[PDB]
Amino acid sequence: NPIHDRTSDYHKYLKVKQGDSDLFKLTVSDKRYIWYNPDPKERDSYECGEIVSETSDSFTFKTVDGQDRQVKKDDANQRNPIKFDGVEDMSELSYLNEPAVFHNLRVRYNQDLIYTYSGLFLVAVNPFKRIPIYTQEMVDIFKGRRRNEVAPHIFAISDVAYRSMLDDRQNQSLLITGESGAGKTENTKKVIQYLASVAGRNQGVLEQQILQANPILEAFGNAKTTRNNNSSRFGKFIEIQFNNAGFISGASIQSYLLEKSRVVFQSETERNYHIFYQLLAGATAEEKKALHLAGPESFNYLNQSGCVDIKGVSDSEEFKITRQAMDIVGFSQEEQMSIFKIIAGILHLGNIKFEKGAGEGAVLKDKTALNAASTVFGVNPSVLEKALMEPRILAGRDLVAQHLNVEKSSSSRDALVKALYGRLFLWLVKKINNVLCQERKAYFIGVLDISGFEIFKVNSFEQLCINYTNEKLQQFFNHHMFKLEQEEYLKEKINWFGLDSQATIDLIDGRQPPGILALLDEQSVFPNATDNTLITKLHSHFSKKNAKYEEPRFSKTEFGVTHYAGQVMYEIQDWLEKNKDPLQQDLELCFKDSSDNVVTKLFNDPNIASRAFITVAAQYKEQLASLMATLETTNPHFVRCIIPNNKQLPAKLEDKVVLDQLRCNGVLEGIRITRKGFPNRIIYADFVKRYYLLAPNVPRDAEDSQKATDAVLKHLNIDPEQYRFGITKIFFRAGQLARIEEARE
Ligand SMILES: [Mg+2]
Structure with a gap:
């Protein structure tokens, strides 16, 4: 067995190689050194400065440069002993700096050792290259071993979670967060792979359907971005259900924040959702025309990014898979026709071109695109048409038709396309749960795969939401850790409430005084309010009045929030609209009556077609509250996925890129935290x-x-x-x- 067999791949790929020497002696050396910056401008850079002379206060040390400086003893980033280079848990390190932490992560990474523990966390750095450690043979090795028994690995945290479930008769959770492209989704699939192996139906039907769901979700919720060729454009909580015997009984999926906008617009080089491309690459020459299908270059929704394909990806071949998965989970052939019809129609609606000319309102000169959409949707064109350009609107008394100009007409079409797609995604999810879910379940292991803190160039409503979720998850962690201590130092014979996260949390979700979301909701009821009133209201209530808020020196459209991970500046453009997420009623009507059996559901099912009615922010707060409650009932596990750099290259572990993530993800806090004791x-x-x-x-x-x-x-x-x-x-x-x-x- 590989654990003992220094020649196995396990040893090869998961452990730091050993020689028959044991010496605390071999290790030995005659001197003592430290971690410094050869230029204080760029602080994440450091070199190892051999300390040469000591004082009582400071320390003199020699530079890589040859030079010699002086540092404060209370400012020293003391290098741990070389023996420590490569330890599996940083909790083992004597000196717990930052460069000390990065160093151990690096020494490991240079050996292709991507997984490392840091106390409670499992840190995982994307290698950007394949490492064969996820085989069945690799699975088998993890079985029943304690964390202390095996090398760091996702499989390891998964096994520990499973035994704890069985042992404590307590539900479990794995929180997998971090940057886009960090390896979140990859690691999640492995968790399920592992679970399915150690707990499924000996060689499974359910197991396969459970397995087959991802790909269905990925074709629809995944897209190529600059950061990832297979970016998840939605968040998820996967619940793996077990019977008291410990076997997989079912599963359930909860999705969040699907990026609907991507349907109608993608940045340069990026791609729209995968399905679009698969549909057009894999449908038969015969399904096409049937759908009036052409190529991506022929569609507005797909010919604008300039990218319509992925290197190392066969959209036609990936489509078989998808279609396959639909078959397994149990999508009726006719259920599947409709899903594709929707995708198609959406493709058609984007092809609609509004022209003005006539007067001041828009008009449809060519009805080619329209017709085609209507056809595939199973809706009556003139109605759709009417609904698109001349929607009836209330004046309390007056239900009257308005004639939309070209832009207003376009946005509506877009709003329609977005509703179609989000509702569809919803339905797919429900439909899958329908198959996999258990009413009757004893325990569960839940896996949260969602981004970590988001701090971009442009931060909008969606970043606020994800960031809000992150503040709550970060508070949960801290709390958890606090508890694992309070009752527990009181276990091996050791000595000795309010969160710092609360204020930020309150600023966003507080009811009284009202926080950002409440005022946002308020502003949402007035049809005639604007981004300006809104931003004015926020500054009015928090500028110089709330310590986690900041009104910009100059911008009139942004505000800053002091988050866990630091200050984030947000822009309010379109927030009222985003909060309401409006769709013209006649549009709803048009589609409520649709030949299509799938379509009808999307507009006819209040569970799908309607929010509550609550706002988008209200719904988000709510689902964030449900999620946490659940978490609160589990024994949690934290996985921190790290990207080594921003270029998607292996062998390139950038100290700045990394530390920044370590800073923002709570890894660095926890350290310094125990650091104290x-x-x-x-x-x-x-x-x-x-x-x-x-x-x-x-x-x-x-x-x-x-x-x-x-x-x-x-x-x-x-x-x-x-x-x-x-x-x-x-x-x-x-x-x-x-x-x-x-x-x-
Ligand atoms: Mg992902």
């Missing part, structure tokens, strides 16, 4: 082992251990605070271990 809390039989020699008394594997522990401390004649005697482990403060290991034989 007693992080190093070693095992007795574990210290005397590597440290029986540095003491003229102590021998290797003995019985009276904690006593033996006393020895070296004695021989080493150490002080009452750098260390702590705790029933099981010897708690060591920071650098205690460094210095210690830093002694002679």
Whole structure:
């Protein structure tokens, strides 16, 4: 078995290679060094400065440059002992700086060791290249092993979650967050792969359908972006259900924040959702015409980015898969026709060209596109038409038709296309749950795959939402950690409420006084309100009045929020519209009556076609509240997915790119946090082992251990605070271990 077999791929690909030497001796060297910046402008850069002279206060050190400087002792980023280079859990490090953390991540990454623990977290750095560690053979090795037993790995956290479920009869959760392209979705699929293996139907029908859902969701909710060729344009919470026996009984999927806008617009080089391209590459020459299908270059919705294909991707071939998956989960052939018809029609509606000329309102000179949409949708063109350009509107009394100009007409068409697509996605999800979900379930393991904090060039309503969710998840973490401590130091014999996250949280979601969303909702009821009134109202209530808010020196359309991960500047353009998310009623009417059986559902099912009516912000707050409650009932696990750089290249781990993520994701906080206490809390039989020699008394594997522990401390004649005697482990403060290991034989 590979765990013991230094020749196995397990050893190869998952562990830091070992030689038959054990020496605390081999390790040995005669000097002591540190972490510095060869230019304080760029601080994430650092070099190792050999300390040469010491004082009492500071420390002089030699540079890579050859030069020599001086630092404060209380400003020192002390380099851990080389022995530590590559440890599996950074919680093991003596000095817990930032460069110290990055260094260990890097040393590992240079060895292709992408997974590392950091206390509670499992850190995973995208390698941007394939690493064969996800085979069934790799699966098998993880089975039933403790975290301390095997190398860091997603499979590992998954197994721990599963045994805890079974053991504690407690539900579990895995929170997988981080930047686009960090490896969130990849890792999530592995979690499910692993679960399906260790808990499914021996070689499964359900298992396959559960497996087959992703690809259905991915064709519809995934798209190529500059950051990822297969970006998830929606968030999700996957619940894997089990019976009391521990076997998979079902599953359920919750989706969030689907990027509807992408349907009608994609940035340069980007792509619209995958399905569009698959549909047009894989339908038969015969389904096309049937759908009046042509090429992407012939569609407005697909010929604007300039990108219509992905390197290493066969849209026609990926379409088989999708269609296949639909078949497995159980989509009727006719259910499938309709899904494709919708996609097609949406493709047609974008092809509609409004012209003005005539007077002031828009007009449809050519009805080619219109007709085609109507056809495939199973709707009556003149109505659609009428609904698009001349929608009836209330004047309280007056239900009267308005004649839309070209732009207004266009936006409506767009609003229509977006509704169609989001409702469709909704339906797909429901339909899948319908098949997979269990009413009757004993336990569950839930997997949250959603982005981490979003701080772009342009931050809008959607970034606020994701950011809000992130503040809550970050608060959950901190709290959790706080608790894992409160009752627990009180386990191995150790000593000794309000969140800093609350204010930010309150600023956004508070009811009284009203926070951003409430005022946003308020402004939403007045039809005649604007981005300006809105932004005016926010500044009015929070400028110089709320500490987490900032009114810009100059911009009149943005505001800043001091988030966990730092300040984020938001722009309010279109927020009223986004909050209401309007669709002309006649449009609804047009479609409520549709030949198409799938279409009817989208407009006829209040579960699909309607919000509550609550606002988009109200609904978001609500679903965020439901999600957390659930989480609150689980034993959680945190995975931090990191991109090594912004270029999608392997072998390029950029200190700035990385640290920034470490800063924003809570990895850096937790560290410094325990940093304060007693992080190093070693095992007795574990210290005397590597440290029986540095003491003229102590021998290797003995019985009276904690006593033996006393020895070296004695021989080493150490002080009452750098260390702590705790029933099981010897708690060591920071650098205690460094210095210690830093002694002679
Ligand atoms: Mg993803």
